[PDB]
Design a protein around this ligand. Sequence first.
Ligand SMILES: *C(=O)[C@H]1NC[C@@](C)(O)[C@](O)([C@H](CC2CCCCC2)NC(=O)[C@H](Cc2ccc(OC)cc2)NC(=O)[C@H](CCO)NC(=O)CN2CCOCC2)O[C@@H]1C
Ligand SMILES: *C(=O)[C@H]1NC[C@@](C)(O)[C@](O)([C@H](CC2CCCCC2)NC(=O)[C@H](Cc2ccc(OC)cc2)NC(=O)[C@H](CCO)NC(=O)CN2CCOCC2)O[C@@H]1C
Ligand SMILES: [Cl-]
Ligand SMILES: [Cl-]
Ligand SMILES: [Cl-]
Ligand SMILES: [Mg+2]
Ligand SMILES: [Mg+2]
Ligand SMILES: [Mg+2]
Ligand SMILES: [Mg+2]
Ligand SMILES: [Mg+2]
Lengths: 196, 196, 222, 204, 233, 198, 198, 211, 221
Amino acid sequence: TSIMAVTFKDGVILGADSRTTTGAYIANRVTDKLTRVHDKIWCCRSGSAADTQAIADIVQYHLELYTSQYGTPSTETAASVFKELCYENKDNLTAGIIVAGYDDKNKGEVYTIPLGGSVHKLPYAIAGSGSTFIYGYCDKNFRENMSKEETVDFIKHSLSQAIKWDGSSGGVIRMVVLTAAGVERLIFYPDEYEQL
Amino acid sequence: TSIMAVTFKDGVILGADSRTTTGAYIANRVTDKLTRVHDKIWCCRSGSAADTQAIADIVQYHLELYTSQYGTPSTETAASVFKELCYENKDNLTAGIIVAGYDDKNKGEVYTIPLGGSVHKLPYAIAGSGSTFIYGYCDKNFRENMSKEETVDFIKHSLSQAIKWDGSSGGVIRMVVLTAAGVERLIFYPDEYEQL
Amino acid sequence: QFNPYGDNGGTILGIAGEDFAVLAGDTRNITDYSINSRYEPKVFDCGDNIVMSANGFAADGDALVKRFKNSVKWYHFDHNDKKLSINSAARNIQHLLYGKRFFPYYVHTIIAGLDEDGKGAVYSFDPVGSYEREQCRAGGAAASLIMPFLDNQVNFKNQYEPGTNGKVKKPLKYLSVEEVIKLVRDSFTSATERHIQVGDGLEILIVTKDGVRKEFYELKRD
Amino acid sequence: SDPSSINGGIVVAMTGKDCVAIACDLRLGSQSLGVSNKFEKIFHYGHVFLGITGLATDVTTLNEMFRYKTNLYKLKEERAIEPETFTQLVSSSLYERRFGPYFVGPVVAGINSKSGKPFIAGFDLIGCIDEAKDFIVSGTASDQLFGMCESLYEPNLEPEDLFETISQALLNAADRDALSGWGAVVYIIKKDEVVKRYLKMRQD
Amino acid sequence: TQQPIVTGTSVISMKYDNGVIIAADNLGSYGSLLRFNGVERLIPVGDNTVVGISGDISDMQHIERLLKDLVTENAYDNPLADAEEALEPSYIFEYLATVMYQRRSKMNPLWNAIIVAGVQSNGDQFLRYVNLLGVTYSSPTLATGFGAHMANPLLRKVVDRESDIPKTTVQVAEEAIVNAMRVLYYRDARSSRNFSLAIIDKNTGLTFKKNLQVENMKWDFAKDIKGYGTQKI
Amino acid sequence: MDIILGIRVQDSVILASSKAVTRGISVLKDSDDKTRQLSPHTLMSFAGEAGDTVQFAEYIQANIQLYSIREDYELSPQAVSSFVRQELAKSIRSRRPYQVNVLIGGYDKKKNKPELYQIDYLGTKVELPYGAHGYSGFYTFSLLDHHYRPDMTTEEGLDLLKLCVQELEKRMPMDFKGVIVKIVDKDGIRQVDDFQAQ
Amino acid sequence: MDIILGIRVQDSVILASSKAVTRGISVLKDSDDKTRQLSPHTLMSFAGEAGDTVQFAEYIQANIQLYSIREDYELSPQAVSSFVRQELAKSIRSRRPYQVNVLIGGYDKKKNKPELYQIDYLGTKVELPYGAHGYSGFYTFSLLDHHYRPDMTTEEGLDLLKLCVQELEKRMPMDFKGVIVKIVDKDGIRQVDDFQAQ
Amino acid sequence: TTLAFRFQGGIIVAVDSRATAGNWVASQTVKKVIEINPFLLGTMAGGAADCQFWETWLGSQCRLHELREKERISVAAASKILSNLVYQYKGAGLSMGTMICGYTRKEGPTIYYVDSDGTRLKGDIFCVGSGQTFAYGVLDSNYKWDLSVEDALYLGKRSILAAAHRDAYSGGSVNLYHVTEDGWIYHGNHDVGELFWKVKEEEGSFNNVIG
Amino acid sequence: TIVGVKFNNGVVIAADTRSTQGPIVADKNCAKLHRISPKIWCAGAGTAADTEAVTQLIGSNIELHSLYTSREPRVVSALQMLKQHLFKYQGHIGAYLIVAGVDPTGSHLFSIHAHGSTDVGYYLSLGSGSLAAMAVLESHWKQDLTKEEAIKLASDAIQAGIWNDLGSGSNVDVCVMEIGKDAEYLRNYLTPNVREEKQKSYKFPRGTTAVLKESIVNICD
Ligand SMILES: *C(=O)[C@H]1NC[C@@](C)(O)[C@](O)([C@H](CC2CCCCC2)NC(=O)[C@H](Cc2ccc(OC)cc2)NC(=O)[C@H](CCO)NC(=O)CN2CCOCC2)O[C@@H]1C
Ligand SMILES: *C(=O)[C@H]1NC[C@@](C)(O)[C@](O)([C@H](CC2CCCCC2)NC(=O)[C@H](Cc2ccc(OC)cc2)NC(=O)[C@H](CCO)NC(=O)CN2CCOCC2)O[C@@H]1C
Ligand SMILES: [Cl-]
Ligand SMILES: [Cl-]
Ligand SMILES: [Cl-]
Ligand SMILES: [Mg+2]
Ligand SMILES: [Mg+2]
Ligand SMILES: [Mg+2]
Ligand SMILES: [Mg+2]
Ligand SMILES: [Mg+2]
């Protein structure tokens, strides 16, 4: 798995590969790893598919019940719920989740929750098996307050490298753009990103 | 450990960090991982310090005896001796060695010998624990037939990133330049490479 | 950690007639749940009117057959082209197998031919060289399915004369070659239905005083 | 170690022309030691017959359990349970103990009293239903029984013929298993009458 | 006893009317890392045999050196080294088969699965498999590792039994091999887009094709897939 | 282990049980009665794990004696054995099972027939003409397969036990310090005090 | 395991050795002589692993008998025991050690004194007034710590063994099928054929 | 199941004829007696290959002795050759229990128990194999030194039948041998299938069976 | 070997009919296609008892839910109920399911793994024959299949399993679920593995078996 979320001038962009493997067999080559928990709060799942799905389903429930009572939850609030499940059930979960959402006051925000169940607020976050190969690239190429076109390019270049080296990563590069404008779904096919 | 060798217009450049660790303790923070086996054939050592030293010492012996009889050995010949030791003793060795040498006919050449004891001739090679983090960066930034200044920059930027992310890597960036001109020793201190 | 042994499945069947003998085996070679080959011969003519099959681990099976074929070649060279009697072959194979008592050939081996009186003979072996002459024997994956059927239909076990109150046993008789081939094909069609490692094809080798003849029959390919 | 291999025993069931047959061996042992030559593994609840192989304590426990449940069924329903219905009761009963199962191989045999249709079925220890038209096998010599049944069996056998076939299938399979034999009993089941016969077999 | 380090994935092959085709991708995997991309796993021996090797690359390079020696040693005191007494596929196979079984029997195996494809001097198609256990078998279609699970089923639709071999052309056979390589690139996580393909025909001889790429890939349907069940956007 | 023998003849059940109780390399006692009277015409011999053996026997004895007073009636040997089997069949799937093997010898006053039941710690019950638990069976069953008749008198039954004990004293490794013999017939339970040299 | 006792009195060494050879659940023999005469005035009793026990005894016997013919002279009990200890001390660090424990009882014709040596499979030699190997010692040493005198006659020595055997027959779990007793004195080695009831 | 016992009329040797592969019955028609020479018998229990190979080998070493010493090998010497060989392989995993039964003018009738542990015992009565305890039960309760050649043959036959019945890993048939000063005499193969019912009726035993 | 294939106006599932105990074939013709609801069908691989039990439980709960809400069962409901149950048991219920069906919201195709992970696709395969089947699907699948094309592709995918996988064999079961019409269950759609006539009849001459004792059994109370 290769997943990342990047804050930019207009909001935040989530990106992921589409490969699920059981051993060396690609069980699903068109997986959607970008999961909605609220209108403009999405998360990137990595680790046990069963565990990350069970968690995301429970979070979506909690935020739907939050919305019913107290209105639109903050991106921080969503990350706190993800944390609470991951930390308190650390012994029975193998889940690494990046939480990214667009608030009108806070703009774009990225929270990463590694295995332990700790929370880390970052300008951008990378995770999954394929992330190890692009720590070098991402640190050198990331600038704050990039344009939409620039941020899409940064994620497209980053994940293409992660896919190229990591066998556990591959397929299509899915992206989800979160701005005041709304929610945009992007897809990039091998025949494009491979020759960057 | 972070090690790499890069072919360029005038020859080849070897680069390495200077950190040796036994667990989390830095046993030596000024290690020389760039080892001479002949006038203009050098190797980068990675894995067991004991194993890589024992091997390098035996190779230097073999090439000194080769030179006495048949004159200057080719960079390929040196790589073949490294291979023969590593492959035939694969069960008792934890050694990953990059072999780089300057020939007047063949110019600069890089051979990499991973754990198995296989041989791979490449334009450039990266190895050691810290290499995982710079596969992304190195693939995107490497061009063939770079200048000396350009190649030193490529290695300096590459190893600085490897050092930044890998705990097993750090200290000074040692380089060894191999051209027709001769052998040049370069060193770059943290106060320089950290702020790139 | 490296495992020197494997299982290539398959099943073999030997029946001795009055003046003939048959050694049959399926032509399927498998690894785990994959088919390697639908036609990989397993029963071999070794010369001196002896047919042999070492079923189990194909590598150890081929190795043993190869060493015995070579053993027959050197018996000729060392004893003025004397014919290796089936009983002499049996004792020779015991030594081949027991030689590797502490790293065994992972095979159940059967040889068929004619004894020195012209009567049909079947010798069967355990992996480490234990051997006994028998009237019939099935070896390999589906041995446990076929042997009870042979006991009943070749040696007439648990069968009695109708209306004798189970006092008079069924006369123990010799089967014809046509009657034996029927039992073999029924044994393998049955084995194929109930065992996943058995099917594809059946290859039978028949040994008479005239030599070694081969019959082939299609089996189910699922 | 393996609870299915301590006591030993076998059961086989076959369908014929407007009839079913269910047979079993009589051996109850403790590993190599033979203890009882009278331990029957076939029980009946009305016109529905159940054969059980595996761990002997569980064979006896399940017999007492299914007598208990069929007795209550008959009082509430005011009719005898049918083979198809009983099969489902056995299945749900076994899967109830999914993570602590009875180490058994049950076999249902009988004729639906209303439709007159012959019925047999087999189960794994956690109650997966194996519904075959021809025959069902269970026990320490299941491999052997599968081989005998697959060869000997032909459809639409008369009760007198089906008896000979199931008897020879059991006897020859039992004589190739160390933990099976020591006497055998065959049930020939028709719409109206049921005949029970003890076979003369090897006592080794 | 050892463990494989740098590894090559599936080798696929089949026989057609006049000869044999064999193919293998150009990847050297270091566990989950796709480390080396310029790796040739089809070793031609003379002009009538191609040896496709999967498994440990260090052991592959050893077998590659053994074959170049077999050629050198065969030429010694042999004036018919390029004619009647040239190396046959069957000679090359039986040698490798002998080595593999000896190494397994010394509990120090060559961690490989090998397919010897070629045409004999009498024009007969040769295709036989051998692995680290010394297990050997022939079939109209052969494939190692992942190829055995996905390639064989597809290649067996073209040649199911022996009688189907004379009915299969070079175009049909190659097309089936090229398709099988794409299917492996879809579902094998240790596979590569770049592969080599070798044809040994009893008329046109040895044709070795380098730098082939998997083309005509269906990905467009991916845009329509969203969430893992209940998600609508 | 401990020797537990039972033999059913014409008009009685005879139970022979070893007198030795051993912990480690020491024989702590040489006169242990490895049996409890459940009812006036039902006797149960037992052998197995150190604590479980007596605890289980006394527990069964308590339950049968309670039933006897409640109903003012003696349960049939068949009924008692069925109760015991179920208790062991429960035990085997409990947190810590009773590791106890039992013989139940009883005279059914209703049928006027002796009955011998053999039950292991799993709850495996079976009715036998003769029974043994542990390693005793390995030698005694072939003896009794040879010498046993169903029409034998109690006197013939004791002679047949004497023959079983002699064989166990010859071929068994451990000194089990002889046996206590008890006869169960129509007149209840009595102990043969003279088996040291009968 | 097997019982190996040795007792040194005024003018003799007495060796008592169990007659039982057991394998699994059966007693294969009840008349086994667990001793070899090394020389006319030196006797060695032995117990341990099934094969090693006799193989080692016969090997030592062969070497002492060879020395006796070469020198036409009998080695002192001390000298024989020192040879045996060294063979076991070699064995313990070999590929497969001899798992054998020995008592060496000998009359030194030079010193005119009986001598008893106890050696275990490690090569741990010690000279004792009385000795035992395995579990026998746990009961016999304390008994012998109280009843032993150095001036005891051979007759008193046999009475003291009878007392040791009685205790082992009372408190030891396994039936060792009695003992074979052998006296080593100035007149050589004789066997007490009447210890079944002395 | 194998036994050999010594009486007034010489030695009786009786064996079953079953080969097992766990709970699988490999064969019901098998030989567990090796006729080494006309006055030397070897019984076989344990590993099939181990027994067959080394007892066939013992036969070779016994022939080699009479060629060398121009004399028949003694039972003691023959037994100790197998004993010493087996001891060389101790810990290797050889599994065999065997009785070497023979008659020489020196020794008279002699039986030697030899097992793969290296144990070598002389004795008058031995039962070896999975069913040894069952054979012992019948044999010990009927043994006298003064049995007729006819009665001793029967007790041996009956002792195997008892073991064939109770022991799951014994049966098929009973092979009888009688050892006099004139050598071994084969007293036939008795299928347990037919012998059981014959004995049951004629003797009145096996009252634990239905029929 | 089980597959699911979406066509333009519905979804089809197919399966083989081989039940195995280790290397032995227990049932030569068992139905692996189960009905959760009238228009939601399930194909099961893994622990046989587990796939049957979990399908019957969710099927029962889906019926009760359908009566309660007075609505047609939805596939996403069967999916959510199966995944939440399988997840709770941490994979100890070894059920691997392809759940397909039509409902008011259209046609649906999902796979469920034993640990409670779900996938959505146009073509899926599970079981020992998964890779043999997926090879055929990845070769022949296109977008906008007809009903007859989808049945052909699904059937071809199971045949790949039957021939090339030892775990799979015998016959092909198919269930077609079209948006407009009733779901049609095609039990033994293909029977390409019919047993050839035996070489001999093994009918015994009456009186062959030896009988000791005979008695009539009492069935009537
Ligand atoms: C009386 O007590 C009989 N009890 C039956 C039995 C079977 O235990 C046996 O010992 C019988 C002995 C005769 C010897 C002469 C030839 C016929 C057999 N033993 C076996 O049949 C033997 C059992 C056995 C197997 C293994 C071991 O040690 C591991 C001990 C005993 N069976 C075999 O050897 C089978 C032959 C059938 O294929 N082979 C294997 O199990 C194959 N493995 C053998 C071990 O090495 C690996 C290969 O007779 C006594 C007297
Ligand atoms: C296509 O790929 C088919 N390949 C065959 C197979 C086996 O993979 C299977 O999943 C098939 C599913 C059907 C069979 C017919 C009933 C409906 C379900 N599964 C089996 O046949 C299954 C195999 C299996 C057994 C055991 C385990 O784990 C231990 C995994 C798979 N068989 C069983 O479960 C048998 C009963 C079958 O008659 N039972 C056991 O083995 C009992 N064990 C269960 C676990 O607890 C220990 C005892 O069909 C696919 C789709
Ligand atoms: Cl991951
Ligand atoms: Cl260093
Ligand atoms: Cl390193
Ligand atoms: Mg650092
Ligand atoms: Mg199949
Ligand atoms: Mg049997
Ligand atoms: Mg019991
Ligand atoms: Mg038996």
